[PDB]
From a paper:
The trimeric spike (S) protein is the major glycoprotein on the [name]-[name]-2 envelope and is responsible for engaging the [name] receptor for viral entry, and thus, it is a prime target for vaccine design and therapeutic antibody development. Receptor-binding domain ([name]) in the S protein plays an essential role in [name] receptor recognition, and mutations in the [name] affecting receptor binding and viral infection have been reported. To unravel the underlying molecular mechanism of the S proteins of Omicron BA.2, BA.2.12.1, BA.2.75, and BA.4/5 bound to hACE2, we determined their atomic structures of the S (BA.2, BA.2.12.1 or BA.4/5) or [name] (BA.2.75) in complex with hACE2 by cryo-EM or X-ray crystallography. According to our previous reports, the binding interface between [name] and [name] could be divided into two patches (patch 1 and patch 2).
Compared to BA.1, the S protein of BA.2 adopts more open conformations (two-[name]-up and three-[name]-up conformations) to bind hACE2 with a binding affinity that is two-fold higher than BA. In complex structures, all S proteins of BA.2, BA.2.12.1 and BA.4/5 (N658S) exhibit a three-[name]-up conformation. In our results, three-[name]-up conformation was observed to bind the hACE2 or mACE2 receptor. Residue N477 of BA.2, BA.2.75 and BA.4/5 [name] forms an H-bond with S19 of hACE2, while A475 engages S19 with an H-bond in the BA.2.12.1 [name]/hACE2 and BA.2.75/hACE2 complexes. N487 in the [name] of BA.2 and BA.4/5 interacts with both Q24 and Y83 of hACE2 through H-bonds, but it only forms an H-bond with Y83, and its interaction with Q24 was absent in complex structures of hACE2 and [name] of BA.2.12.1 and BA.2.75. Notably, R493 of BA.2 and BA.2.12.1 forms a salt bridge with E35 from [name]. T500 of hACE2 is hydrogen-bonded with D355 in the RBDs from BA.2, BA.2.12.1 and BA.4/5. An additional H-bond between T500 of hACE2 and R357 of the BA.2 or BA.2.12.1 [name] was also observed. Compared with the residue N501 in PT [name], Y501 in these four Omicron RBDs forms π-π stacking interaction with Y41 in hACE2, contributing to the increased binding affinity towards hACE2.
Residue numbers in the entry:
A (entry chain A): 19 to 614
B (entry chain B): 333 to 527
């Protein structure tokens, strides 16, 4: 028998036992998440240990089948999933050190406390606390104190742990035949062997740079608008030809600009569209919200939800003595068990979150027939994009008027469309330069283009050039400001957000074109359109079986990520901003500093 | 008179595994095909080569009733001319098949919290089965070019593997009990007829 014939038998056996072990692990984790108790932690440790072990033994066994002797490109993907070791290639003396470094560097982040000045007894922690001041206060000095306290007494403790993290993971990177840890991260987007659909690892940097070059002007105009409306609020602290101080952007790190609507609203006399009081005045509940979401999905063309979803799934906070997490998640336990845990309330935000998680569940249901190792999204940005387009389409005034929440007499005026577009832009357009800058900095640090003694100096000059944000106080080579974020201190990738943002609008434009919608793109609903549902399902069915280029081509018609639909979404806002910015300066100079 | 024992086949407390399917010969009795309908959801009640309505009009010499428990999504594999895993290594029907196939859900009986590991099915086999044949031998499957010597390991697998039914699994993974009714005409007087 050939080596390709032997591989299929091993894969069948692996799938059979993997499904059962994974279901046990997921059920234990769910039982703990819906019921906090020490016995549940004990249950959740044993199942995890058994799974991780199993997987290690199978990975060890799957390396006696040479790769250059299998020619189906479907066995090849599963063997590539099993064969990767990654972290076990290092010797035992360094594997323990890496785990200790990661655990300690995570503990320093979670257990963090900025003791305020004078009074020493009072001290404040992130989460409830040093996040409320940055999101709601309006005093320059208070915000600067919070910013600098967090930067100084959480980052210096993490600098001489990241300094070893970098080398100890670069060693693992070239121990698995790579060039650095950045290439290891970028390897998700790599496709080899399928003619007309190859995507190399290095093409991602070029694609990101070329998309940002087109995004830039809209960001510049939004930046100018915010600078004007923000210099209005702070009498004389912001120069009119310079950058923006980093401690007054609405959140600690400036990741989202959404906490500026109260200061940058276009027309402050016209309120937004909130239907919470209407829902309350009709005796709504959780079941009604989820049946409306299911009704929308069935109207599009996708199937209903299984009886298990309605029996074994917790939609309301249990209350009483039971304590459970209330972070909305969508669970795919396997073997036909799909559940949603969400502590929902009667609110429009919960109404949209229901659609988001409902789309997660639908996408999970779509590829249930694929092999075990191919039951995931094509890349790391498709799943959340599919989740987000549903919430995009479910918040339009037309859809709300269809379901009775919004009265028919409501008239869409142009003064509210601009408000909605600005509120959306403060969250979508704002985060893209931040994400791009952070990924480029991490890639250069891992590669070796940034010497060990120029970290912060390079970081802040990039921060000035790309994002237009300037620090209020000077930082030497002792702080570790980028480590101040969950994702840098806990080893997660960050380009997934950029890719998801650019994918969701491509999907939305394709679906709206399939639905014969006329007018602006932001007023589009894909309800009552079976063509759009079929076009979407054609890609949801594939999973990881096909390259993500082909999956994108199935829906959009192109083999690469494109940043024209997003600009088409924000055309009225761009015209309005150009009209409003005819007496100011668009752009910033990287010389002015609030500390002079 | 004398009423064939269909309620020892459709109502037993324990069914057999797929690879050890029970076959019961029914002869020398009057069979009414009407207590059979007094179930409920009959997920599948397909009849091949025989009219279900005109069923109480034809006489046969032997009637065979097979019993086993399979998964929900494998019911479609019990039909003449199907390829897969159950119909190649566990239970295969001839192309010129006369009879009926009946299936129904048994989640409330054959499923327990923790895992009902009492149901097995063969997954490895050198060659396909001939129609109406069973194999209950447990020897290690040699998937490689080296002798196995009766020990499980590399390129050596145990041919049987359990189902593990839990009460929260989906419809496609829930237990289903299947009874197959077979008929034949031989060179003997037909001693099986309806009332
Ligand atoms: C939560 O755990 C407690 C103690 O283990 C148990 O008594 C209770 O029944 C559990 N709740 C549910 C819904 O299973
Ligand atoms: C790859 O293997 C699958 C079975 O898992 C088979 O259906 C498919 O035809 C194979 N590919 C080719 C090109 O034959
Ligand atoms: C680790 O990975 C390398 C390259 O993939 C491989 O050659 C090696 O055998 C693996 N080690 C084990 C035992 O997992
Ligand atoms: C469920 O799905 C079927 C098939 O699409 C449809 O006819 C039915 O109206 C849906 N509604 C229910 C009852 O879930
Ligand atoms: C709405 O349109 C009218 C007519 O063109 C214009 O005068 C008005 O300024 C517009 N309002 C907004 C908010 O664009
Ligand atoms: C979808 O079609 C149904 C039936 O024609 C209708 O009741 C509903 O209002 C439609 N929804 C939208 C958003 O047009
Ligand atoms: C199965 O046995 C139970 C036990 O009395 C009886 O109630 C039921 O009617 C029987 N069903 C059939 C189809 O014989
Ligand atoms: Zn989500």
């Amino acid at each position: 028998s050939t080596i390709e014939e032997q591989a299929k038998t091993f894969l069948d056996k692996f799938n059979h036992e993997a499904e059962d072990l994974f279901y046990q692990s997921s059920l234990a984790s769910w039982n703990y998440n819906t019921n906090i108790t020490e016995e549940n932690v004990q249950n959740m440790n044993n199942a995890g240990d058994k799974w991780s072990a199993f997987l290690k033994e199978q990975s060890t066994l799957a390396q006696m089948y040479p790769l250059q002797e299998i020619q189906n490109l479907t066995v090849k993907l599963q063997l590539q999933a099993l064969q990767q070791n990654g972290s076990s290639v290092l010797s035992e003396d360094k594997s323990k050190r890496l785990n200790t470094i990661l655990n300690t560097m995570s503990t320093i982040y979670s257990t963090g406390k900025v003791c305020n000045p004078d009074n020493p007894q009072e001290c404040l922690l992130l989460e409830p606390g040093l996040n409320e001041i940055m999101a709601n206060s309006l005093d320059y000095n208070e915000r600067l104190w919070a910013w600098e306290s967090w930067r100084s007494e959480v980052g210096k403790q993490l600098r001489p742990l990241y300094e070893e993290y970098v080398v100890l993971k670069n060693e693992m990177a070239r121990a698995n035949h790579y060039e650095d840890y950045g290439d290891y991260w970028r390897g998700d987007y790599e496709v080899n062997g399928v003619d007309g659909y190859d995507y190399s690892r290095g093409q991602l940097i070029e694609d990101v740079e070329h998309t940002f070059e087109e995004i830039k002007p809209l960001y510049e105009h939004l930046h100018a608008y915010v600078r004007a409306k923000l210099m209005n609020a702070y009498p004389s602290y912001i120069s009119p030809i310079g950058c923006l101080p980093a401690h007054l952007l609405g959140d600690m790190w400036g990741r989202f600009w959404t906490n500026l609507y109260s200061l940058t609203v276009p027309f402050g006399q016209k309120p937004n569209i909130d239907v919470t009081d209407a829902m309350v005045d009709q005796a709504w509940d959780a079941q009604r919200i989820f049946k409306e979401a299911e009704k929308f999905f069935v109207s599009v063309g996708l199937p209903n939800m299984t009886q298990g979803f309605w029996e074994n799934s917790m939609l309301t906070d249990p209350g009483n003595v039971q304590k459970a997490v209330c972070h909305p998640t969508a669970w795919d336990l396997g073997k036909g068990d799909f559940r949603i845990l969400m502590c929902t309330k009667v609110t429009m935000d919960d109404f949209l979150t229901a659609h988001h998680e409902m789309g997660h569940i639908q996408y999970d249901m779509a590829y249930a027939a694929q092999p075990f190792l191919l039951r995931n999204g094509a890349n790391e940005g498709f799943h959340e994009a599919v989740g987000e387009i549903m919430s995009l389409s479910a918040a339009t005034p037309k859809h709300l008027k269809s379901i009775g929440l919004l009265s028919p007499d409501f008239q869409e005026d142009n003064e509210t469309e601009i408000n909605f577009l600005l509120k959306q832009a403060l969250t979508i357009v704002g985060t893209l330069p931040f994400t791009y800058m952070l990924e480029k900095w991490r890639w250069m640090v891992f590669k070796g283009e940034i010497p060990k003694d120029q970290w912060m100096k390079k970081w802040w000059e990039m921060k000035r050039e790309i994002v237009g944000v300037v620090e209020p106080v000077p930082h030497d080579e002792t702080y570790c400001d980028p480590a101040s974020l969950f994702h840098v201190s806990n080893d997660y990738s960050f380009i997934r957000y950029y890719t998801r943002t650019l994918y969701q609008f491509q999907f939305q434009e394709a679906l709206c074109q399939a639905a014969k919608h006329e007018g602006p793109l932001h007023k589009c609903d894909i309800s009552n359109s079976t063509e759009a549902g079929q076009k979407l399902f054609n890609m949801l069915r594939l999973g990881k079986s096909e390259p993500w280029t082909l999956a994108l081509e199935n829906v959009v018609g192109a083999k690469n990520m494109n940043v024209r639909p997003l600009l088409n979404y924000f055309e009225p806002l761009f015209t309005w901003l150009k009209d409003q910015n005819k007496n100011s300066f668009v752009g910033w100079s990287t010389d002015w500093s609030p500390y002079a | 008179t004398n009423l064939c024992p269909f309620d020892e086949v459709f109502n037993a407390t324990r069914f057999a595994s797929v690879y050890a399917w029970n076959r019961k010969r029914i002869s020398n009795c009057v069979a009414d095909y009407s207590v059979l309908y007094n179930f409920a959801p009959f997920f599948a009640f397909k009849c091949y080569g025989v009219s279900p309505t005109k069923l109480n009009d034809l006489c046969f010499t032997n009637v065979y009733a097979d019993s086993f428990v399979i998964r929900g999504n494998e019911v479609s594999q019990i039909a003449p001319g199907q390829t897969g895993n159950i119909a190649d290594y566990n239970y295969k029907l001839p192309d010129d098949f006369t009879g009926c196939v009946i299936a129904w859900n048994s989640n409330k009986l054959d499923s327990k919290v923790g895992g009902n590991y009492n149901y097995l099915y063969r997954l490895f086999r050198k060659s396909n089965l001939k129609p109406f044949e069973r194999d209950i031998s447990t020897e290690i499957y040699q998937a490689g070019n080296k002798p196995c010597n009766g020990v499980a390991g590399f390129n050596c697998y145990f041919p049987l593997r359990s189902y593990g039914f839990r009460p929260t699994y989906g419809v496609g993974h829930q237990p289903y009990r299947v009874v197959v009714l077979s008929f034949e005409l031989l060179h003997a007087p037909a001693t099986v007829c309806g009332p």
